[PDB]
Amino acid sequence: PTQTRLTLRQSIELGEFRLRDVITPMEILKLSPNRKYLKSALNQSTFNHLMGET
C-alpha cells in the first residue's frame, strides 16, 4: 500500500531500514503459527525488544 511504500522510502532515504515499518510485532504474532516461542511474558518482552529499533 502507498502508505507503507512512502514510509519505507522515507526510512531508506536517511540510510537505514527500520523493520517496524513493513510489519508490526502484533502482526507478527497474529500471522504466525502459535509456538512455545513467543508464548511467555518474558519471551514476548524480549521479542518486542529485539523487534523495535534495536
Binding site: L14, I23, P33, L38
Partner: protein, 331 residues
C-alpha cells in the same frame, strides 16, 4: 522518454537510481543515452575508440552497439592484488562482456559496420599503468593505441588533477583530426570548469556542454561534447595548460556569463522535473514508464538484473507478504 536534457554549444540519497531499472553493476549508459541524441548525427564509427577509466564498460557497450568502431581500447584502474586466490583475471568489464558487442565479437559475427570489433584492453600487468596519473600510464596508452589512430575517446574519470590532464593530452595526441571527445566534467568547481574549457578550446572546436537527463540532479554533472579541430597549429599541450593558468589567474573566465545563467536556469527546472519524475515513479509504481530508454538498453544487451539478485516469489496479496515474514522472523 526523457528529453529534458539540454545542450549549451560554446551528501544526498541516490534517489535517481530508481529511473535506472536495467543493468548488472554500473548503469552509466543511462547518462550516455542523452549523449547519443546529439552524437548519432555525426560520424564517429570510423577509427578506433578509447575509453579511459570506463570501469564496468556499460557506456562502452551502448556506444558500441549503435556507434561501432574497428578497435576498442578499454582502460580502467585495476591491480592483480585483488584477484581471488589461484586466479589470474585480467581487467575485463563485467558489464561489457555480457553485452551485445562482446557477445557478437566472441562468436565472430561482424558488427553493424561490417568490420569485426577488435577489443584490446590496455593491460600488461602493471597497476601504475592502469592509473592515469602516472606518466608511465600515459606513455604506454599512447604507445599501444598509436598517435592519430582513433576518433572517439570517452573519458569518464570522476572528479586540475594529474589524471585528468593526463587523460586530456592522451586524447590530444591520439585523436584523429575531426575526432570526437566526450568528457565527464563537473560544473560545481567552476574554476576547474573554466580551466578545462580554456585548455580544450585551444585545440578543440565545437565545444558543446550537455547535461544528461539521467544524471544525478544534485551533482552538477556535464558531459563535454567537443570535436578535435582540423589542422591543429597548436604548439604543444604545456603551452595550452600554462596559458590557461594565466587566464584563470589574470582575467575573467572564458565562459560568457549569459551561458552560465542559461545553464543555471535550465538546471533548476531540469532538477525539479527529474525529482518529480522520480517521486512519481516511486509512489505510483506505474509499470511502464520511459520505454524507449530501456528499449535502447535491451537492444544494447542489457537485461533486468533483479531476477538473479531477488529470487524471492511475487506474492499477489499483501496479507500473504506479511504472513511470509511472520513465518520467517518467528522461525
Amino acid at each position: 522518454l526523457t528529453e529534458f536534457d539540454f545542450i549549451l554549444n560554446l551528501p544526498q540519497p541516490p534517489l535517481h537510481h530508481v529511473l535506472r531499472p536495467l543493468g548488472l553493476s554500473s548503469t552509466s549508459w543511462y547518462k550516455t543515452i542523452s549523449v547519443l541524441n546529439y552524437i548519432s548525427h555525426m560520424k564517429i564509427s570510423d577509427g578506433a575508440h578509447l575509453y579511459l577509466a570506463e570501469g564496468s564498460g556499460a557506456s562502452m557497450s551502448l556506444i558500441e552497439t549503435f556507434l561501432p568502431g574497428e578497435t576498442i581500447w578499454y582502460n580502467s584502474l585495476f591491480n592483480s592484488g585483488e584477484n581471488p586466490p589461484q586466479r589470474n583475471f585480467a581487467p575485463l568489464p563485467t558489464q561489457f562482456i555480457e553485452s551485445v558487442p562482446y557477445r557478437l565479437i566472441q562468436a565472430g559475427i561482424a558488427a553493424g559496420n561490417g568490420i569485426v570489433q577488435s577489443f584490446y584492453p590496455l593491460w600488461n600487468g602493471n597497476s601504475d599503468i592502469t592509473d592515469l596519473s602516472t606518466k608511465t600510464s600515459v606513455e604506454y596508452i599512447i604507445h599501444k593505441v598509436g598517435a592519430d589512430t582513433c576518433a572517439l575517446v570517452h573519458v569518464d574519470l570522476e572528479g586540475l588533477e594529474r589524471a585528468q590532464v593526463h587523460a586530456l593530452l592522451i586524447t590530444v595526441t591520439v585523436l584523429k583530426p575531426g575526432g570526437l571527445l566526450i568528457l565527464k566534467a563537473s560544473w560545481e568547481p567552476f574554476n576547474r570548469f573554466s580551466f578545462l574549457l580554456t585548455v580544450l578550446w585551444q585545440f578543440f572546436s565545437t565545444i558543446r556542454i550537455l547535461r544528461s537527463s539521467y544524471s544525478d540532479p544534485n551533482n552538477h554533472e556535464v558531459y563535454i561534447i567537443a570535436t578535435l579541430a582540423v589542422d591543429p597549429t597548436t604548439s604543444s599541450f604545456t603551452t595550452a595548460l600554462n596559458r590557461a593558468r594565466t587566464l584563470n589567474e589574470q582575467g575573467f573566465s572564458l565562459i560568457p556569463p549569459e551561458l552560465v545563467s542559461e545553464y543555471w536556469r535550465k538546471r533548476v527546472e531540469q532538477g525539479q522535473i527529474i525529482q518529480d519524475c522520480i517521486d512519481k515513479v516511486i509512489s505510483e509504481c506505474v509499470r511502464d514508464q520511459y520505454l524507449a530508454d530501456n528499449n535502447i538498453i535491451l537492444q544494447a544487451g542489457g537485461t533486468p538484473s533483479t531476477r538473479k539478485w531477488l529470487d524471492l516469489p511475487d506474492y499477489s496479496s499483501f496479507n500473504e507478504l506479511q504472513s511470509e515474514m511472520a513465518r520467517l522472523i518467528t522461525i
